[PDB]
């Protein structure tokens, strides 16, 4: 397949994006590292970690710093959820802009390859509360910045992956 | 057009997915059967049944069994909503995993052709309640299993249909 | 690039759709007009107007009439948000069907070119209230009618634009 340094996989909830990333990583022949961002505070979350369940590294908050110091040419890092990392930062009261831009810059310079698995959260109605609105905005921005940084971007819909980067973007004259 | 046994049409709310399926079925020249899953409990729901309004068969709960015993080579079955069928099972307190996997297996062996019309519900924020979270998960899984089972899959966005299966899925080397 | 009269840009929240439309318009060499539909009632909304911030024309309610009387061959009109216009009509208690169909007809006959920027809101769960359900339905219908009316339609996901119109739509035989 096409040789790259960085892939962003975007999909909705229970879209198959994690299975797509996990089977791409398992097919790669690299040393696999799951970068796990989910805080197993309850059994529903441990349940989703168990279902997905490789070297496992927890990175609930320091995702970018973890990528920089775990990435190796011989390793493939899979970020289990960009979304759950952002959630962790938001709930704590952290400003989300700097870590997002820091992560995109990191995505551009790793010592080894990385797949980022991230949710689309922006294609429903406006949330009725400011925390959910901020989260929706920050996740949308984050996916834009990661798509710009990464070599390749795939959208996963109903378990089917479509490549959207590389790809020529449309141009219109008026 | 391309001859197939099974089509999954996925789209958001008021996306045109039902019109796409209905005009494909009307253009087919087969005997048309609407498999209606919507329980007309209120006038908003009867209103949506009336707007869409062929042999009409109600299948509020027993969707797969209804497909197996209504499918014929000369017939095309259209499932008006996978989503409203899942909703019916969820609200009752049914476990959703077995009927979903049963339906995908059914989608693989009918005596005649079928179009499944289903919603994408996974590309908004995490629901604030466990019933809605379960439903979101089950609908995502269901669309994955139906996409795997069906000959063809179309995504309908703003009334425009894009074929995503058949189609080569992307491969990356790292 | 491809010469057209009318483009619909659809995306989720913080998808990059506004940046895609703004940089297409800035690259065009036409006289630029922002058709601004957002009512700056609060600082969050003024904040989003300021971030996006060309001749600026407010059209909170009379969007179609504003397009007809501002469109010129030498001008490109960008509708900053179809979604916030619909929101304005909904909250007031207006019926949304006629203005939507009026706008699609307008999109078909302008004296000059137009880009419509609109949200996808239909790919989450069913809203728990009738106002949000109506809005979701009306926005879905509106995007269908504008996609039918416009020369070209682009979906923007994670800041990446994919053209879906023009494009041959799939056909299946059963």
Q: How far apart are CA A126 and CA A120, in angstroms?
A: 14
Q: Does residue A155 belong to the interface with chain B, where contact is any CB pair within 8 Å? A: no
Separation of CA B40 from chain center: 18
Summary count for chain A: helices (H), strands (E) = 6, 9
Residues of A in contact with B161 (CB under 8 A): none
Summary count for chain C: helices (H), strands (E) = 6, 9
Would you state the structure tokens that stand for residue C164, as one six-digit string? 């879906």
- By the 8 A CB rule, do A126 and C81 touch? no
Just list the catalytic residues of C: 52
Task: Return left, alpha or beta for B58; rule: phi > 0 is left, psi -120 to 50 is alpha, else beta.
Answer: beta
Helical packing angle, B97-107 and B82-92, nearest 10° = 150
H/E run at residue A90: helix A82-92
Helical packing angle, C82-92 and C130-149, nearest 10° = 140
CB atoms under 10 Å from CB of B70, counted, come to: 18
Domains, chain C, ranges and CATH?
6-165 (3.40.50.300)
Please indicate whether residue B52 is annotated as part of the active site.
Answer: yes
The DSSP string of C16-44 is SHHHHHHHHHHHH-SEEEEEE-----SHH
- By the 8 A CB rule, do A120 and A9 touch? no
H/E run at residue A97: helix A97-107
Would you state the structure tokens that stand for residue B43, as one six-digit string? 């006038």
How far is CA B49 from each of CA A10, A18, A145, B121, B139, rounded to the nearest angstrom?
34, 36, 42, 20, 21
Q: Does residue A165 belong to the interface with chain B, where contact is any CB pair within 8 Å? A: no
B156, β-bridge pairs: B11, B161
Summary count for chain B: helices (H), strands (E) = 6, 9
H/E run at residue B11: strand B6-11
Q: Across the interface, which of B10, B125, B141 has its CB nearest the CB of A121?
A: B125
């Amino acid at each position: 397949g096409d040789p790259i340094k960085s892939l962003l996989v975007v999909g909705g909830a229970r879209s198959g994006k994690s299975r797509f990333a996990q089977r791409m990583a398992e097919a790669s022949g690299r040393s696999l590292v799951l970068i796990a961002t989910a805080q197993p505070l309850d059994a529903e979350m441990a349940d989703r970690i168990s279902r997905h369940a490789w070297t496992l590294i927890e990175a609930f908050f320091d995702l970018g710093q973890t990528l920089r110091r775990e990435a190796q040419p011989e390793r493939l890092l899979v970020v289990d959820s960009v979304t759950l990392w952002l959630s962790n930062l938001l709930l704590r009261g952290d400003d989300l802009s700097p870590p997002i831009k820091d992560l995109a810059r990191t995505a551009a310079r790793l010592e080894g390859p990385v797949i980022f698995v991230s949710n689309e959260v922006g294609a429903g109605i406006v949330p009725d509360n400011a925390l959910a609105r901020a989260f929706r905005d920050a996740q949308g921005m984050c996916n834009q910045r990661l798509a710009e940084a990464c070599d390749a971007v795939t959208l996963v819909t109903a378990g089917i992956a479509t490549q959207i980067k590389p790809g020529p973007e449309p141009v219109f004259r008026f």
